[PDB]
Design a protein around this ligand. Structure first.
Ligand SMILES: COc1ccc([C@@H](Cc2nnn[nH]2)NC(=O)c2ncnc3[nH]ccc23)cc1
Length: 164
């Protein structure tokens, strides 16, 4: 049910939208979370997704961490999407602000290829320190499944589209 997306490639689409409001409107099979290895959903996409689930995402995440330990940088896990989606694919992109290797961003995007269609943010951008133009390039060059990108900042959306 995605609408108002601009087509970038055969499988990559983009919209200036809040991923939480997109998830509520569409109820996608998969919503991607921009997670950290601990699944501590404090801010950004994670804090926003968590708050929309009334903290049910954090409770579920803490139980997952208690059982399995932390995720790898570039890794992922599939948990419930609660009221936003059937599933939430928690993906850990490298945090450039913590000295994490930017090459792990390709590995993080590879997790998207296990799902036919996903609603997602740009990985490693925002508070994770990577260049969003670089993140979009890696997305297009790595993801083969149908990905619908929600870009929150209008000025960033315009820059991403005009430079692609
Ligand atoms: C920690 O990794 C991050 C990854 C991406 C991000 C940024 C990248 C970005 N910056 N301007 N639009 N996009 N995205 C969001 O914060 C974002 N995107 C879509 N819908 C949203 N609703 C609430 C937040 C939000 C930050 C952090």
């Amino acid at each position: 049910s995605f609408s108002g997306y601009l087509k970038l490639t055969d499988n990559v689409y983009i919209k200036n939208a809040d991923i939480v409001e997109e998830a509520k409107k569409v109820k996608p099979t998969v919503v991607v979370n921009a997670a950290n290895v601990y699944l501590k959903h404090g801010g950004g996409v994670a804090g926003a997704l968590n708050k929309a689930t009334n903290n049910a995402m954090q409770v579920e995440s803490d139980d997952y961490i208690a059982t399995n330990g932390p995720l790898k940088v570039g890794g992922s896990c599939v948990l419930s999407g609660h009221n936003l989606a059937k599933h939430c694919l928690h993906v850990v992109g490298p945090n450039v602000n913590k000295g994490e290797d930017i090459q792990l961003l390709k590995s993080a995007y590879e997790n998207f290829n296990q799902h036919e269609v996903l609603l997602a943010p740009l990985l490693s951008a925002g508070i994770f320190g990577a260049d969003p133009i670089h993140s979009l390039r890696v997305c297009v060059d790595t993801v083969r499944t149908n990905v619908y990108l929600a870009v929150f900042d209008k000025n960033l959306y315009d820059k991403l589209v005009s430079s692609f």
